Amino acid sequence: TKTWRKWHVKVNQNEKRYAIASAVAASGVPSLLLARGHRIEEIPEVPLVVDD
Amino acid sequence: PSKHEQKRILQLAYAIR
Amino acid sequence: GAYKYLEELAKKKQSDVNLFLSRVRAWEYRQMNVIHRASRPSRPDKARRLGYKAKQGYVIYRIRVRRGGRKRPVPKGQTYGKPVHQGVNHLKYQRSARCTAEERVGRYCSNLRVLNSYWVNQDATYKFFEVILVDPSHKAIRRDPRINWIVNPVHKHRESRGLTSIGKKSRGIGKGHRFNNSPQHATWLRHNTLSLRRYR
Amino acid sequence: AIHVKGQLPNAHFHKDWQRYVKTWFNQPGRKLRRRQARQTKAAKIAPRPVEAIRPAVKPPTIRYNMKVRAGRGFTLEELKAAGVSRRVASTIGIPVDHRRRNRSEESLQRNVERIKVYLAHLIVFPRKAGQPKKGDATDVSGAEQTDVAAVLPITQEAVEEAKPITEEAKNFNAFSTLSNERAYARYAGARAAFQKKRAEEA
Amino acid sequence: APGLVVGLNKGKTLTKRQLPERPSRRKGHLSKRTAFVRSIVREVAGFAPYERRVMELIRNSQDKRARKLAKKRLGTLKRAKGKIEELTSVIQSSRL
Amino acid sequence: KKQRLVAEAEAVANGKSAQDVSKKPYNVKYGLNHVVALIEAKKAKLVLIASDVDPIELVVFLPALCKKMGVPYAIVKNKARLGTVIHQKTAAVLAVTEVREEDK
RNA sequence: UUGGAUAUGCCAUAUAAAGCGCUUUCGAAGAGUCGAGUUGUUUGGGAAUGCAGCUCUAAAUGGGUGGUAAAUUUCAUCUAA
RNA sequence: UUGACCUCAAAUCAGGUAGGACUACGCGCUGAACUUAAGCAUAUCAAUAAGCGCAGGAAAAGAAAAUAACCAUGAUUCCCUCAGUAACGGCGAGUGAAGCGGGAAAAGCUCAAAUUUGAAAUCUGGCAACAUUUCUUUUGUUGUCCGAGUUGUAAUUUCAA
């Protein structure tokens, strides 16, 4: 094995931003939160926003 | 008069003082 | 001053005066040792313009170097290889005889720093050189701001590493496109390095 | 032995290249090191800006002469026009470029007003506190570390907006003029020879 | 041509300035002391053997042969022509 | 020289005319660069050249220089005699530029 | 322990030194080195790219360089040893 | 005859300095062959390995005898780009830079060639005094002798002047 193997890998910034927006949208869906493994059966609202 | 001696004159006067 | 006259007279070294002086000086330099200490520079203005000051800590040595090309030290003139490497005779040392004169004097006086050197004479067997040397332990040198730089440890054996005037000449140091080989290992290493960035 | 589609291979890899592979795993480390050194310099050099003022110059080719970049230092001619001696310019943070010159009044003025803006906005502390000499500021309480780019940025020439069409522009064959000038320059050497040969013949 | 990329005076016209004369460009100008010293050295030293040979050829009026010898000795024809004019000035002054 | 500087320094301390208390020195001129410059400036009245300057180029031009500039010059025996005149071990050349009226 | 400021104390001969400004002025500038030929060795440098050996050896607006050799004439640029 | 000077010697003379190791990275010298070209001699490997010399915490390079042909740039180094390009090559295998442009970092200078000539103004050392300390371990100052130095040490100048 060599050190000059490719460890880091490039993603287009627009596609990185696509994924970030998609993940934020996913966080806004209660069904996806329960499916992923979050115990949100008793939380008041999604998205859960608290005061400053 | 020679200027460099004038500096030397001042140096020796300072030493004597 | 007389240094101007000395310089323009030294330009005329095919004159009868210089030819006679070349004869007598070359004779007496051959009668001395190959490396012998010079009491004073034989070209005081040449030494002066190259950096020699006439005070304690400055030394002049005369050395004669055998002229000609290099002889391959292979035994019996045999190379054991491809025919593009069979030359034995017409090969050339890549450093000048002025470099060779400097570095032999530098070994002779290991306690001194080789400042610079100049040609003084030549014949069919030798080229005679005078090497300007500086004592780095001498206080007259250590207290002179115009020559302290050579006391620093990064200037040990300037001539051996190629840092004297003729040494930089021999390894091709210069500004512009004509060189472009410049520092050879540095330039060769610069391109032959394969820069593999993280993101690629 | 090369039988596939594509271009003929050109890999310059017949030396010992693995000996000289350069990796960039220290790229984030060097970036942080440069940041820390830059901040160390910022704190150490006092109010003085971390970057000296630079002149506005034009790159030397047809590909780049329409742009303005930063030069090395201000010429001695520009410093004289701005009223700053070369001895004090290096002390107050104005670089000096003895090699450059002002072949045009436009380049001269461009950098002179740059020095004038720098001089107007510069607070020079007295060498001895409380004894303001010539050029020294009287109050230095408000001294701050500011950015020379913010105080005086490199400005690009902007093309004028719409302008009226005149008749001398209307009666101007651009392509014919281009062809005529190219031909005139091409054969100017032959014309000079012909005028010469005519003179001795006459 | 001014402001037309192609032509003889090609390029943008932006006024003009008279650049100050750089002291480095003065190099090559013959000085009074340098002229005096070189005259003294020429009297003290004399001429090289090839300079002597060229002067004889100029005296005997083989200008082409003297030019070819000087080019052979110096290496370039420009330096040869400069040496010929230098040595013929010596001849004229000595006749004077 | 040290005595004269001490005496004049005391004169300054006593606030008298230091610039006029002393008289113009009358002495021979020495040093190769200094003498050569004097000959070129036509200030030299007499030039004495050491016969055995070991690098002869240092003085070889001097007779021709003095002849052009109309300076009377002589080649005197030995470098050390010129040295002992100027309180040195060696003097390549000496120059007389001004003397006193009795020695004119 | 060190750093740059600050408070004053003392020592400090500006009898000095320095920048700037105009000169009808003057302005020294590195040689067996540059350059040339040649032979090696080098370079992407191809009518030699650099270096070295040998031979020849400058000059004073001179000497470099402007990537086709030569002579010639201009122009830029730079100021080696 | 005594002397002066030059040159060259001696001393377990007074005080210093050099080597050796290390060598990853620096500067040089010296220098191959296997290999590739489906053979092989130019070439390639490679201006590499081995050999040798000399450094530093970096080294080297460096304030243009530099580019460019522009409306011009402006020490060096490194990065990206130029660019697998111009070019070199049994024009085969192969090899192969630079100017620009963007960035990191920026910092400039010193002598030689000048008559201080109404003043060798310069400096090592011996001695004695003080002072100073990362330090009784360090580093200087002042005086006084001997010397060095006019065959040129200071001041002044470096072409941008």
GROMACS .gro file of N, CA, C and O in nm, chain C residues 16-94:
model
  316
   85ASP      N    1   5.567   4.451  -2.355
   85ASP     CA    2   5.700   4.404  -2.321
   85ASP      C    3   5.722   4.402  -2.170
   85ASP      O    4   5.791   4.314  -2.117
   86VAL      N    5   5.665   4.500  -2.100
   86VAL     CA    6   5.679   4.505  -1.954
   86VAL      C    7   5.615   4.383  -1.890
   86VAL      O    8   5.677   4.314  -1.809
   87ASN      N    9   5.490   4.354  -1.926
   87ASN     CA   10   5.420   4.241  -1.866
   87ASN      C   11   5.479   4.108  -1.909
   87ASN      O   12   5.482   4.013  -1.830
   88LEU      N   13   5.524   4.097  -2.034
   88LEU     CA   14   5.586   3.973  -2.080
   88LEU      C   15   5.714   3.944  -2.003
   88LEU      O   16   5.740   3.828  -1.968
   89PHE      N   17   5.796   4.046  -1.979
   89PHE     CA   18   5.917   4.026  -1.900
   89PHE      C   19   5.883   3.988  -1.756
   89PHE      O   20   5.943   3.896  -1.699
   90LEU      N   21   5.788   4.059  -1.696
   90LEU     CA   22   5.748   4.029  -1.559
   90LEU      C   23   5.685   3.890  -1.549
   90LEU      O   24   5.702   3.821  -1.448
   91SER      N   25   5.610   3.850  -1.652
   91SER     CA   26   5.555   3.715  -1.653
   91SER      C   27   5.665   3.610  -1.654
   91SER      O   28   5.654   3.507  -1.586
   92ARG      N   29   5.771   3.633  -1.732
   92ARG     CA   30   5.881   3.537  -1.737
   92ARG      C   31   5.947   3.520  -1.601
   92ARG      O   32   5.963   3.407  -1.552
   93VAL      N   33   5.988   3.631  -1.538
   93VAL     CA   34   6.064   3.622  -1.414
   93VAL      C   35   5.976   3.571  -1.300
   93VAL      O   36   6.021   3.492  -1.216
   94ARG      N   37   5.850   3.615  -1.295
   94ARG     CA   38   5.761   3.570  -1.189
   94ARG      C   39   5.727   3.422  -1.204
   94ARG      O   40   5.725   3.349  -1.104
   95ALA      N   41   5.700   3.377  -1.326
   95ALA     CA   42   5.671   3.235  -1.347
   95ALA      C   43   5.790   3.148  -1.309
   95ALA      O   44   5.772   3.038  -1.256
   96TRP      N   45   5.911   3.196  -1.336
   96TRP     CA   46   6.030   3.121  -1.298
   96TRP      C   47   6.040   3.107  -1.146
   96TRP      O   48   6.064   2.998  -1.094
   97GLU      N   49   6.023   3.218  -1.074
   97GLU     CA   50   6.040   3.214  -0.929
   97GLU      C   51   5.924   3.146  -0.859
   97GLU      O   52   5.942   3.090  -0.750
   98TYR      N   53   5.804   3.151  -0.917
   98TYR     CA   54   5.692   3.077  -0.859
   98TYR      C   55   5.709   2.926  -0.876
   98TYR      O   56   5.664   2.849  -0.791
   99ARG      N   57   5.772   2.883  -0.986
   99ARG     CA   58   5.801   2.741  -1.001
   99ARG      C   59   5.909   2.695  -0.904
   99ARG      O   60   5.909   2.579  -0.861
  100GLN      N   61   6.002   2.784  -0.869
  100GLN     CA   62   6.109   2.748  -0.778
  100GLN      C   63   6.061   2.738  -0.634
  100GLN      O   64   6.126   2.673  -0.552
  101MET      N   65   5.949   2.802  -0.601
  101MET     CA   66   5.887   2.790  -0.470
  101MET      C   67   5.804   2.662  -0.466
  101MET      O   68   5.812   2.577  -0.555
  102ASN      N   69   5.723   2.646  -0.361
  102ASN     CA   70   5.637   2.530  -0.348
  102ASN      C   71   5.508   2.549  -0.427
  102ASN      O   72   5.473   2.661  -0.467
  103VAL      N   73   5.438   2.438  -0.450
  103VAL     CA   74   5.312   2.444  -0.525
  103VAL      C   75   5.213   2.536  -0.456
  103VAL      O   76   5.147   2.618  -0.520
  104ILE      N   77   5.202   2.525  -0.324
  104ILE     CA   78   5.125   2.618  -0.242
  104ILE      C   79   5.222   2.686  -0.147
  104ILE      O   80   5.283   2.620  -0.062
  105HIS      N   81   5.236   2.817  -0.161
  105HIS     CA   82   5.324   2.894  -0.074
  105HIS      C   83   5.258   3.027  -0.039
  105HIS      O   84   5.188   3.086  -0.121
  106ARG      N   85   5.281   3.072   0.084
  106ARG     CA   86   5.220   3.195   0.132
  106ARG      C   87   5.282   3.315   0.063
  106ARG      O   88   5.405   3.328   0.057
  107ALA      N   89   5.198   3.403   0.011
  107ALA     CA   90   5.243   3.527  -0.050
  107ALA      C   91   5.249   3.636   0.056
  107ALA      O   92   5.150   3.661   0.126
  108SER      N   93   5.365   3.701   0.068
  108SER     CA   94   5.381   3.806   0.168
  108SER      C   95   5.285   3.921   0.143
  108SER      O   96   5.225   3.976   0.236
  109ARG      N   97   5.269   3.960   0.017
  109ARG     CA   98   5.174   4.063  -0.023
  109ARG      C   99   5.118   4.024  -0.158
  109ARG      O  100   5.180   3.947  -0.232
  110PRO      N  101   4.999   4.074  -0.194
  110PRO     CA  102   4.946   4.048  -0.327
  110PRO      C  103   5.039   4.100  -0.436
  110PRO      O  104   5.094   4.210  -0.425
  111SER      N  105   5.056   4.020  -0.541
  111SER     CA  106   5.133   4.066  -0.656
  111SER      C  107   5.052   4.157  -0.746
  111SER      O  108   5.109   4.227  -0.830
  112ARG      N  109   4.920   4.157  -0.730
  112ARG     CA  110   4.829   4.249  -0.799
  112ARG      C  111   4.745   4.315  -0.691
  112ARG      O  112   4.629   4.276  -0.669
  113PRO      N  113   4.800   4.414  -0.620
  113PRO     CA  114   4.727   4.470  -0.505
  113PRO      C  115   4.591   4.527  -0.540
  113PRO      O  116   4.498   4.517  -0.459
  114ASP      N  117   4.575   4.587  -0.658
  114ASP     CA  118   4.446   4.641  -0.697
  114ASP      C  119   4.348   4.533  -0.740
  114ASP      O  120   4.227   4.547  -0.718
  115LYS      N  121   4.397   4.425  -0.802
  115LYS     CA  122   4.309   4.312  -0.833
  115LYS      C  123   4.256   4.249  -0.705
  115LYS      O  124   4.137   4.218  -0.694
  116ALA      N  125   4.344   4.228  -0.607
  116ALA     CA  126   4.300   4.179  -0.477
  116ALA      C  127   4.208   4.279  -0.409
  116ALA      O  128   4.109   4.241  -0.346
  117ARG      N  129   4.239   4.408  -0.422
  117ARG     CA  130   4.158   4.513  -0.359
  117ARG      C  131   4.015   4.512  -0.410
  117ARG      O  132   3.920   4.519  -0.331
  118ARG      N  133   3.997   4.504  -0.542
  118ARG     CA  134   3.863   4.506  -0.598
  118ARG      C  135   3.789   4.375  -0.577
  118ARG      O  136   3.666   4.372  -0.592
  119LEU      N  137   3.859   4.268  -0.544
  119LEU     CA  138   3.795   4.141  -0.516
  119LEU      C  139   3.759   4.124  -0.369
  119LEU      O  140   3.689   4.029  -0.334
  120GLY      N  141   3.805   4.214  -0.282
  120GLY     CA  142   3.762   4.214  -0.144
  120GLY      C  143   3.874   4.212  -0.041
  120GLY      O  144   3.847   4.200   0.079
  121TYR      N  145   3.998   4.226  -0.085
  121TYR     CA  146   4.111   4.217   0.007
  121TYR      C  147   4.137   4.354   0.070
  121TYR      O  148   4.157   4.453   0.000
  122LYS      N  149   4.135   4.358   0.203
  122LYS     CA  150   4.178   4.475   0.279
  122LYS      C  151   4.315   4.449   0.339
  122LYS      O  152   4.347   4.337   0.379
  123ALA      N  153   4.396   4.554   0.347
  123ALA     CA  154   4.533   4.542   0.395
  123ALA      C  155   4.541   4.561   0.546
  123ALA      O  156   4.597   4.657   0.597
  124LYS      N  157   4.481   4.466   0.618
  124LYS     CA  158   4.484   4.466   0.764
  124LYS      C  159   4.493   4.323   0.813
  124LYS      O  160   4.475   4.227   0.737
  125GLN      N  161   4.522   4.308   0.942
  125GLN     CA  162   4.540   4.177   1.002
  125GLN      C  163   4.413   4.093   0.989
  125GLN      O  164   4.302   4.142   1.013
  126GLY      N  165   4.431   3.967   0.952
  126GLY     CA  166   4.321   3.877   0.923
  126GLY      C  167   4.304   3.843   0.777
  126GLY      O  168   4.227   3.752   0.745
  127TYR      N  169   4.373   3.913   0.687
  127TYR     CA  170   4.368   3.887   0.544
  127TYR      C  171   4.498   3.821   0.501
  127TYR      O  172   4.607   3.866   0.538
  128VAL      N  173   4.486   3.714   0.422
  128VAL     CA  174   4.600   3.631   0.385
  128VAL      C  175   4.598   3.608   0.235
  128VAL      O  176   4.492   3.600   0.173
  129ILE      N  177   4.717   3.599   0.175
  129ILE     CA  178   4.733   3.570   0.033
  129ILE      C  179   4.821   3.447   0.017
  129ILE      O  180   4.932   3.442   0.072
  130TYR      N  181   4.772   3.348  -0.057
  130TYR     CA  182   4.848   3.230  -0.098
  130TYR      C  183   4.856   3.219  -0.249
  130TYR      O  184   4.757   3.240  -0.320
  131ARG      N  185   4.974   3.182  -0.298
  131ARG     CA  186   4.997   3.156  -0.439
  131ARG      C  187   4.999   3.005  -0.462
  131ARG      O  188   5.064   2.931  -0.387
  132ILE      N  189   4.927   2.960  -0.564
  132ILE     CA  190   4.919   2.818  -0.597
  132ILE      C  191   4.925   2.802  -0.748
  132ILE      O  192   4.860   2.876  -0.822
  133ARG      N  193   5.004   2.705  -0.794
  133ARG     CA  194   5.010   2.671  -0.935
  133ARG      C  195   4.936   2.541  -0.959
  133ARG      O  196   4.954   2.443  -0.886
  134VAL      N  197   4.850   2.540  -1.061
  134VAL     CA  198   4.766   2.426  -1.095
  134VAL      C  199   4.805   2.377  -1.234
  134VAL      O  200   4.819   2.458  -1.327
  135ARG      N  201   4.823   2.246  -1.248
  135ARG     CA  202   4.861   2.190  -1.376
  135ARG      C  203   4.746   2.205  -1.475
  135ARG      O  204   4.632   2.167  -1.446
  136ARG      N  205   4.777   2.260  -1.593
  136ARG     CA  206   4.676   2.289  -1.692
  136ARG      C  207   4.635   2.163  -1.768
  136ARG      O  208   4.679   2.051  -1.738
  137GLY      N  209   4.550   2.182  -1.868
  137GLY     CA  210   4.505   2.074  -1.953
  137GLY      C  211   4.369   2.021  -1.911
  137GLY      O  212   4.307   2.068  -1.815
  138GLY      N  213   4.324   1.920  -1.985
  138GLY     CA  214   4.199   1.854  -1.955
  138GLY      C  215   4.216   1.749  -1.848
  138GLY      O  216   4.322   1.730  -1.789
  139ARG      N  217   4.106   1.678  -1.822
  139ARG     CA  218   4.105   1.572  -1.723
  139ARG      C  219   4.140   1.439  -1.787
  139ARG      O  220   4.110   1.414  -1.904
  140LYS      N  221   4.206   1.354  -1.709
  140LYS     CA  222   4.241   1.219  -1.750
  140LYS      C  223   4.158   1.121  -1.667
  140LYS      O  224   4.166   1.123  -1.544
  141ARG      N  225   4.079   1.038  -1.734
  141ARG     CA  226   3.999   0.940  -1.664
  141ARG      C  227   4.089   0.851  -1.578
  141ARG      O  228   4.187   0.795  -1.630
  142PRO      N  229   4.060   0.835  -1.449
  142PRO     CA  230   4.148   0.756  -1.363
  142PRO      C  231   4.125   0.607  -1.376
  142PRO      O  232   4.170   0.529  -1.291
  143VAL      N  233   4.054   0.566  -1.480
  143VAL     CA  234   4.034   0.422  -1.504
  143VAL      C  235   4.168   0.357  -1.533
  143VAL      O  236   4.252   0.418  -1.603
  144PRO      N  237   4.195   0.237  -1.482
  144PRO     CA  238   4.325   0.174  -1.510
  144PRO      C  239   4.335   0.130  -1.655
  144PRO      O  240   4.240   0.075  -1.712
  145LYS      N  241   4.452   0.155  -1.714
  145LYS     CA  242   4.484   0.116  -1.851
  145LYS      C  243   4.390   0.178  -1.954
  145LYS      O  244   4.385   0.133  -2.069
  146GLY      N  245   4.316   0.282  -1.916
  146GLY     CA  246   4.227   0.351  -2.007
  146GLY      C  247   4.110   0.269  -2.056
  146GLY      O  248   4.070   0.281  -2.173
  147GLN      N  249   4.052   0.185  -1.970
  147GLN     CA  250   3.943   0.095  -2.006
  147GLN      C  251   3.821   0.128  -1.922
  147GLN      O  252   3.832   0.149  -1.801
  148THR      N  253   3.704   0.133  -1.986
  148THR     CA  254   3.584   0.186  -1.923
  148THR      C  255   3.476   0.082  -1.893
  148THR      O  256   3.395   0.106  -1.803
  149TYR      N  257   3.473  -0.031  -1.964
  149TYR     CA  258   3.377  -0.139  -1.940
  149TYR      C  259   3.233  -0.090  -1.953
  149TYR      O  260   3.156  -0.086  -1.857
  150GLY      N  261   3.196  -0.050  -2.074
  150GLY     CA  262   3.061  -0.006  -2.096
  150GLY      C  263   3.030   0.022  -2.242
  150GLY      O  264   3.104  -0.017  -2.332
  151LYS      N  265   2.918   0.091  -2.262
  151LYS     CA  266   2.873   0.125  -2.396
  151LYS      C  267   2.973   0.219  -2.464
  151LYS      O  268   3.045   0.293  -2.396
  152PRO      N  269   2.981   0.216  -2.597
  152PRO     CA  270   3.083   0.296  -2.667
  152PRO      C  271   3.069   0.447  -2.648
  152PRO      O  272   3.161   0.520  -2.686
  153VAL      N  273   2.959   0.495  -2.590
  153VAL     CA  274   2.939   0.638  -2.570
  153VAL      C  275   3.007   0.680  -2.439
  153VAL      O  276   2.995   0.794  -2.395
  154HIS      N  277   3.081   0.587  -2.378
  154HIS     CA  278   3.151   0.617  -2.254
  154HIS      C  279   3.296   0.568  -2.258
  154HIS      O  280   3.356   0.550  -2.151
  155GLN      N  281   3.353   0.548  -2.376
  155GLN     CA  282   3.488   0.496  -2.391
  155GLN      C  283   3.594   0.606  -2.394
  155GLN      O  284   3.713   0.574  -2.402
  156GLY      N  285   3.555   0.732  -2.387
  156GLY     CA  286   3.653   0.840  -2.385
  156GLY      C  287   3.735   0.837  -2.258
  156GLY      O  288   3.685   0.811  -2.149
  157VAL      N  289   3.865   0.864  -2.273
  157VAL     CA  290   3.957   0.858  -2.160
  157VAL      C  291   4.041   0.985  -2.152
  157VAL      O  292   4.082   1.026  -2.043
  158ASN      N  293   4.060   1.052  -2.265
  158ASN     CA  294   4.163   1.154  -2.278
  158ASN      C  295   4.106   1.295  -2.289
  158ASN      O  296   4.141   1.382  -2.208
  159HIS      N  297   4.019   1.320  -2.386
  159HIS     CA  298   3.973   1.455  -2.415
  159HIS      C  299   3.860   1.502  -2.324
  159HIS      O  300   3.783   1.590  -2.363
  160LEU      N  301   3.848   1.443  -2.205
  160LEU     CA  302   3.745   1.480  -2.110
  160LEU      C  303   3.790   1.600  -2.028
  160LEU      O  304   3.909   1.624  -2.008
  161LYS      N  305   3.692   1.676  -1.979
  161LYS     CA  306   3.716   1.805  -1.915
  161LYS      C  307   3.659   1.807  -1.774
  161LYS      O  308   3.544   1.766  -1.753
  162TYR      N  309   3.738   1.855  -1.679
  162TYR     CA  310   3.687   1.886  -1.546
  162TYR      C  311   3.582   1.996  -1.555
  162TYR      O  312   3.602   2.097  -1.624
  163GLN      N  313   3.470   1.977  -1.486
  163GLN     CA  314   3.361   2.074  -1.494
  163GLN      C  315   3.384   2.196  -1.407
  163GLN      O  316   3.316   2.298  -1.426
   0.00000   0.00000   0.00000
